């Protein structure tokens, strides 16, 4: 089944491409700035549907994280024109490129908060971090800075979907290993850090691992599984029995076809 959540974000494919285009066109890139914009869209009962976006200019200092420049007024006037075009376009959130977070992320957030308590922050990188979905969404309010593993899926309107198409187990398994490796890197990292007296001293991180191990996996290993297994083969044995029968049934329908083809050919003179 697909993953769903309390709040949910749907981000349109149109939106994503727009960021790709913004990064190359503004031509400011090659200074390695944050490419930031405001996201617009359609929201209802508890669904963010990101219907629209627009880029915002920004210039930040390249030797100070306290000194950055952004204009509010630009947001009102442009918003005003959008309201005039389509009134089904509310302020949902904003976007930042990532792939790392800033202190300053907190600073763009305070502003969007005012306009609506819920401001989604989407971390979008074209440059492929992940070979599944390379876009991840968080929703943040400060305590400190929170995050949320809110689903991201690509819904669409009728027009949007056709355009996409104009332009144009095994998958599971590659991803599965991937995930293992990401955690693996983190442990090696943790060991290093602890060795060299670096901030990690988080209780949570040890706590999650311990429980996880107790359970064990069952697509490998037998160690914890063996008692469960005894039941398991018996159920599988039955599914297979069913499968057998149906293969004969299929085979039979193929015989009917052949006999008919044979008859037809034979009487004709024979020609395929």
């Amino acid at each position: 089944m697909p993953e769903l959540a309390v709040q949910k974000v749907v981000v349109h494919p149109l939106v994503l491409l727009s960021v790709v285009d913004h990064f190359n066109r503004i031509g400011k890139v090659g200074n390695q700035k944050r490419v930031v914009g405001v996201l617009l869209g359609s929201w209802q009962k508890k669904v963010l549907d990101v219907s629209n976006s627009f880029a915002v200019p920004f210039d930040e200092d390249d030797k100070d994280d306290s000194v950055w420049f952004l204009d509010h007024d630009y947001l009102e006037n442009m918003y005003g024109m959008f309201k005039k075009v389509n009134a089904r376009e509310r302020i949902v959130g904003w976007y930042h490129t990532g792939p790392k977070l800033h202190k300053n992320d907190i600073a763009i957030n305070e502003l969007m908060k005012r306009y609506c308590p819920n401001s989604v922050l989407v971390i979008i990188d074209v440059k492929p971090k992940d070979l599944g979905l390379p876009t991840e969404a968080y929703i943040s309010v400060e305590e400190s800075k929170t995050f949320e593993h809110v689903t991201s899926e690509i819904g669409a309107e009728e027009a949007e979907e056709v355009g996409v198409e104009h332009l144009l187990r095994i998958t599971n398994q590659v991803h599965g290993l991937k995930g293992l490796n990401s955690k693996l890197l983190d442990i090696r990292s943790y060991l290093e850090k602890v060795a060299t007296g670096k901030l990690p001293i988080n209780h949570q991180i040890i706590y999650q691992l311990q429980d996880v191990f107790n359970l064990l996996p069952d697509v490998s290993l037998q160690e914890f599984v063996k008692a469960f297994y005894l039941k398991t083969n018996d159920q599988m044995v039955v599914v297979y029995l069913a499968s057998l029968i149906r293969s004969v049934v299929a085979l039979h329908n193929l015989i009917n076809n052949k006999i008919a083809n044979r008859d037809a050919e034979k009487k004709e003179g024979q020609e395929k």
């Binding site: 083969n233 018996d234 044995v237 297979y240 029995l241 499968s243 057998l244 293969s247 004969v248 299929a250 085979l251 193929l254 015989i255 076809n257 052949k258 083809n261 044979r262």
Partner: protein
Amino acid sequence: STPLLPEVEAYLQLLVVIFMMNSKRYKEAQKISDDLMQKISTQNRRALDLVAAKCYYYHARVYEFLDKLDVVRSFLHARLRTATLRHDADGQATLLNLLLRNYLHYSLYDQAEKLVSKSVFPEQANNNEWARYLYYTGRIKAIQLEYSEARRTMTNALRKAPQHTAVGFKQTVHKLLIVVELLLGEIPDRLQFRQPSLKRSLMPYFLLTQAVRTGNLAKFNQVLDQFGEKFQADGTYTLIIRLRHNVIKTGVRMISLSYSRISLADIAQKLQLDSPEDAEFIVAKAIRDGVIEASINHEKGYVQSKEMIDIYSTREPQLAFHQRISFCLDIHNMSVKA
């Protein structure tokens, strides 16, 4: 092609005619065949569309009865060389079948091992065109005691061939087929057996099969004495001895009851009929073997065994599903082939 065919056919007609019109015995027409056989010798690679087995074939059948015309081997051996292997394959393959027969009847099946090794070398033919190949092939394997393998080959032989000369050929295959069930020790139902072969002929095999199913030795000996002849006739004698073992082996198997103890005494009473008093020794062999398994105390005069209620709870059906799917699947691919 158009001129070739009448000349050969005249030769061919010549041979039909001489049998009991220019003979009165099956050793006088032969003199006439031998001079005509020259023709085959003469054209080498100027042809490949031929049949050339017949002359040699008529000569040859007679040696199979128990007569002396063993000269013929020399002749077939030369022919396998004349065809290169890479040239004139289909005709070579037919010849190899007739040589293989001659050898099978009389002595050393070992020379067939080799023949088989030849048989799989680059050909432009197939060895399943005349089922007779399978029949010979089966006896070889039978001796060696692969009951299963012989079964496959024989059964494939029965497919796509009888509906004419079903008369003689089904009877020979059918007699061996029955024997193989006895040898394997797994014997099917009595209903089935009736309809194969000629009914009169079916009868000696049936008496034998029934005795083996009862699993009692004395009846097996009495019937066997009457039917010395069949084994002799066939040219496969070794079977007569081999079957003796099988009765006893079925008999222990037959007697499988249920309970954590069966008295040793009980087994011994049933067993008394099979063998005078060689009972425990047989039983021990059987348990050890792993066909059945048990613990015996002669001390407490009981046999203790394992219980089973756990069938269908372990891999034995898993093997079955896999084997069964496969049969259906080959034909499903096959229908598409057309």
